[PDB]
């Protein structure tokens, strides 16, 4: 009793290969209303639908040097149904620039009773109809975020299992309706744990995930994974090289991610714009065999400069846009192993972008 | 700890209230699409008022029903509806000693990759919903998963995913002061015999209790709502009420911890009278049974009422006495004291899919 | 495809009901050579086969007031094939006194790699042939001991799973060959954990166990369980009532042990002879509904007085024997809720019998 | 940590030695009861010396074989036997660049309650055994589990128990410096087609790698020994070497982490020459294959040798050249360079049960 036909598997797989084609990566512009608000407050802008439309507009209409950098773009539900100044729907703006459109489908984390503050994610109710709809409207891929935490007795067995299940239900429903699912089991960087602990935990999580995906009969060639890199915790006193991070990371992946997975688009998760690209580059230079695309799905770490440059003010449109492009180019070269820093890393692009997920 | 001693005690208290001796539950929680087929069968139109009137028929029946019905399961719409005399429907229920329950699942959905098997959806925002339902009078809740015996079903994915959504559902409920009725339904569809049902029943309950343990569920503040253990609907071999009873009671002895407060069976398709008869054979089994074994019946309390009502206001009393006799027969069946039918009380209620 | 026939299930079940018939319990005389040696050294006796035969002989031939107290007796492989002074095989000595003979089949704990000193147990190789043999030779039940520890990150998921599996393989093999298995998942009392932690851990373990037994198609009515009571740890500073121990214990069992289990024969595990009987009594007096026999499978806690009285010396035969009988009578009344202490608890019967399982 | 950086490196080193480019393994580890049926087929008696002589035939073949054979799997008895010239058999092996392996399982045992399915036993005292075997020259080890495709098989219990004994086995091995070859055999018995094998193959490997993760196995210091993915022996539909290849290589892309150092296929019943041909189609698949794909063959390196030997000392050279050509053909097959049979090299080696 198969889930998918031969044609359904070719579609899903083509979609997944176009998004991580060599040199390309993912821009994640999928912050919810309550989330993007904390971004605009920090540059003194009212969080209006129109400033939301305007800022998204700024990223999706940057010049055509980004086109070979940006293979996909993840939008929030609001944005998917907004239009640029010239009247073209944002879906079509990204399509016309060579990027697959994607849509955030989860509905946020909820607490797991009887745990030390662990969560699962909700969002499956009516998901198959939402996906068919999003597909009509231009979305060819989906995103769902699960959050785990390294700490005192966490991630617990219950939270590794439950998170991995639900990422399996979500992916089954997307594939049925035409959409590549991005499976994001993010392990947070909060805490003082060292690098090898984040490797261990990540290896335990991604194995639970790819068992669950197998149990749910998910078509891996039409999926992508967006995990965290293996890093020491935010508060870890000890210091680790960028090549130590590339070794821990590639090794965690080689021990768990089956080669049929079409690619791995890392989240930046609190890394500065520059640390994200240096560590992504270091990973793509690791000489160990890596049979999947290793690129980016960066939200904060592609937009920090652009957002401080824009400041809220219409007349910085082109100066914001350019900081973003400069980043899309950095990370396209990083996702190929060709990124050598200019030595001039902007203050905004050196600022830690971490926020305790308390 | 998932819960405090005070929260745990409030759940043990409710669960015990529902399934007190000689009491069972009225499962009146038909969705608006499935109460449509019960009304279509009696020529009545599917209108908000005709559902309101039918539900008021069942809730306002006479006080003989009060010791029979510890809990009434209601659909959303009916929770916010009122009797003719102005009272909201939950206050009618409480006024007669019934605890009010709320069905909170959002139905089945296909599971890709299986032969026609499903999950159950409904978890999104369930915490806020329960919080509110508890403020509006509801103290227990209901969630149905649905498995079917076929050549390759219930599969491992099916059993494991439905036990996991049940447990999630139950965990949310209990954090909001709501007693969860856990409902893993094995449907009677197909030609399997009794042993097969028994094997599947055991296999599904073992998976259910394990999942509930993993999710830290307080079992004293749960009810279990399982199918009886019966042959398939299309089975040619036949079996006595004593065989059904033995096998149902065996299967639950081997899988259900004594801490679970009550077992409230679904009727599943059985005639009003076979459901009562079987429930009585179960309770008369000499084996030891550490939990209440009672009824949470929809069709097997409602089929004669609906026919006797006919959509006609003048039939209210007649149709209300039909409910009250099946409520009274099950009150005795769930104490082993029912020693009895009529055509409507002997008609198969089996529907497919 | 069933594992057992109707007759095979009646045999196994009858055997299991005869062993915990009201008022009866289990004497565990199944210490290995290396283990019983540490017992005899502590009364200054050479650990010879003949002193081993003699001491076992002392317990199995005590007067016939023990017969209604002792429903089964677990022997080690050596003992099963020894003979009393009058030439009668020990199996037959216990049979003639009304007790089922039982045999220890495990081969001791081994380390689980990558854990903090956790173990599983080994002993399955050739087990089905050993069981058929033991059955010919008089054994109607078997014992296998799994050990878990409460501590820093233990019992771990791996050790709960693996232990529970292997207890499932062992029980499948016993039933096939005619023998009731006693499933012993002992959680050690070592450590300073409080009572509610031992409840929690015990509830998690016994649920893993009875899932595994279900997965392996084990016939529960022809099984018994020998768990630890729920107690605070040995080093726990805090103090707990005997009724608090009976509440934690009965509650842990009601939440996990399906009613079809024929009985629960507690291990004494470091409790004094007297604490074991008071806590067993308190448990059988707990007014909560308990649908299984709640009796004893005591090794150390039936033999401490007898062994210090015997001292190694043939002429204390009858004085040793009597301390043991006095204990079998205590615990038969306890397993009925009828044990009220004499106030005169012997020093040997008040001595802690704990030994760090380091 | 299960292991130190130094222990891990010694395991990565051995695993890589075995499956170096153009090298595969000689699976010469027949138990004394199963080498009895290979000898009975050539009229030879089953005596300690006749097994010693046959094993010496295969081990002392000429140096052309040295670049083909990175590892030789031996049965206990043969590990302590000697060549005519006095050398112990492992030193013969090492002298020609072969790593010596030891089969350490104690066979299959029925799993109650299933349709004829088995586990594998052999864990008791395995740590001491390995410790000693490593002292006597062995650096890898072998353990075979056996699953069969049938209407209700491989069941969930079967898949889960055999993945768990494999992992235990592998954990013990690695604590003693021994590279474990993990062998989950899906037998070719039955009439299933290729898709079925593929589905089952994927399902079993996903369970294997999960179990290995749970038990903390260092995958760089393991080898995987899986069946190719082929139709059932009694399947009427037929399939090309390209289809077999695609499907085998797909199934392993979807389940085997790139960290596993090598995949050493079992022949499973295929003729000496079909096994070679298939291995070559696998390695020529243009898809990406992050691990070595090579051979650990018993019958598909030994069938022509045994026939040409006939039990007759004078046939030694003839029978040794038969081994050396299949060793040489597979050395090329596992590089995609085999472009070729004979009756004995084309005969089905399928046996039942």
From Swiss-Prot, chains A, C:
<dbReference type="GO" id="GO:0008092">
    <property type="term" value="F:cytoskeletal protein binding"/>
</dbReference>
<comment type="function">
    <text>Catalyzes the reversible conversion of beta-D-fructose 1,6-bisphosphate (FBP) into two triose phosphate and plays a key role in glycolysis and gluconeogenesis. In addition, may also function as scaffolding protein.</text>
</comment>
<feature type="modified residue" description="N6-malonyllysine">
    <location>
        <position position="308"/>
    </location>
</feature>
<feature type="modified residue" description="Phosphoserine">
    <location>
        <position position="35"/>
    </location>
</feature>
<feature type="modified residue" description="N6-acetyllysine; alternate">
    <location>
        <position position="107"/>
    </location>
</feature>
<comment type="pathway">
    <text>Carbohydrate degradation; glycolysis; D-glyceraldehyde 3-phosphate and glycerone phosphate from D-glucose: step 4/4.</text>
</comment>
<feature type="modified residue" description="N6-acetyllysine; alternate">
    <location>
        <position position="38"/>
    </location>
</feature>
<keyword id="KW-0704">Schiff base</keyword>
<feature type="modified residue" description="N6-(2-hydroxyisobutyryl)lysine">
    <location>
        <position position="95"/>
    </location>
</feature>
<keyword id="KW-0007">Acetylation</keyword>
<dbReference type="Pfam" id="PF00274">
    <property type="entry name" value="Glycolytic"/>
</dbReference>
<dbReference type="GO" id="GO:0007339">
    <property type="term" value="P:binding of sperm to zona pellucida"/>
</dbReference>
<dbReference type="GO" id="GO:1904724">
    <property type="term" value="C:tertiary granule lumen"/>
</dbReference>
<dbReference type="GO" id="GO:0070061">
    <property type="term" value="F:fructose binding"/>
</dbReference>
<feature type="binding site">
    <location>
        <position position="39"/>
    </location>
    <ligand>
        <name>beta-D-fructose 1,6-bisphosphate</name>
    </ligand>
</feature>
<dbReference type="GO" id="GO:0034774">
    <property type="term" value="C:secretory granule lumen"/>
</dbReference>
<keyword id="KW-0322">Glycogen storage disease</keyword>
<feature type="modified residue" description="Phosphoserine">
    <location>
        <position position="42"/>
    </location>
</feature>
<feature type="modified residue" description="N6-acetyllysine">
    <location>
        <position position="104"/>
    </location>
</feature>
<feature type="binding site">
    <location>
        <begin position="268"/>
        <end position="270"/>
    </location>
    <ligand>
        <name>beta-D-fructose 1,6-bisphosphate</name>
    </ligand>
</feature>
<feature type="modified residue" description="N6-malonyllysine; alternate">
    <location>
        <position position="107"/>
    </location>
</feature>
<feature type="modified residue" description="N6-(2-hydroxyisobutyryl)lysine">
    <location>
        <position position="143"/>
    </location>
</feature>
<feature type="cross-link" description="Glycyl lysine isopeptide (Lys-Gly) (interchain with G-Cter in SUMO2); alternate">
    <location>
        <position position="38"/>
    </location>
</feature>
<keyword id="KW-0225">Disease variant</keyword>
<feature type="modified residue" description="N6-acetyllysine">
    <location>
        <position position="326"/>
    </location>
</feature>
<feature type="modified residue" description="Phosphoserine">
    <location>
        <position position="128"/>
    </location>
</feature>
<dbReference type="InterPro" id="IPR000741">
    <property type="entry name" value="FBA_I"/>
</dbReference>
<protein>
    <recommendedName>
        <fullName>Fructose-bisphosphate aldolase A</fullName>
        <ecNumber>4.1.2.13</ecNumber>
    </recommendedName>
</protein>
<feature type="modified residue" description="Phosphoserine">
    <location>
        <position position="32"/>
    </location>
</feature>
<dbReference type="GO" id="GO:0031093">
    <property type="term" value="C:platelet alpha granule lumen"/>
</dbReference>
<dbReference type="InterPro" id="IPR029768">
    <property type="entry name" value="Aldolase_I_AS"/>
</dbReference>
<dbReference type="GO" id="GO:0061827">
    <property type="term" value="C:sperm head"/>
</dbReference>
<keyword id="KW-0597">Phosphoprotein</keyword>
<feature type="cross-link" description="Glycyl lysine isopeptide (Lys-Gly) (interchain with G-Cter in SUMO1); alternate">
    <location>
        <position position="38"/>
    </location>
</feature>
<keyword id="KW-0360">Hereditary hemolytic anemia</keyword>
<keyword id="KW-0324">Glycolysis</keyword>
<dbReference type="GO" id="GO:0005615">
    <property type="term" value="C:extracellular space"/>
</dbReference>
<dbReference type="GO" id="GO:0004332">
    <property type="term" value="F:fructose-bisphosphate aldolase activity"/>
</dbReference>
<keyword id="KW-0832">Ubl conjugation</keyword>
<dbReference type="GO" id="GO:0015629">
    <property type="term" value="C:actin cytoskeleton"/>
</dbReference>
<feature type="modified residue" description="Phosphotyrosine">
    <location>
        <position position="1"/>
    </location>
</feature>
<dbReference type="GO" id="GO:0006096">
    <property type="term" value="P:glycolytic process"/>
</dbReference>
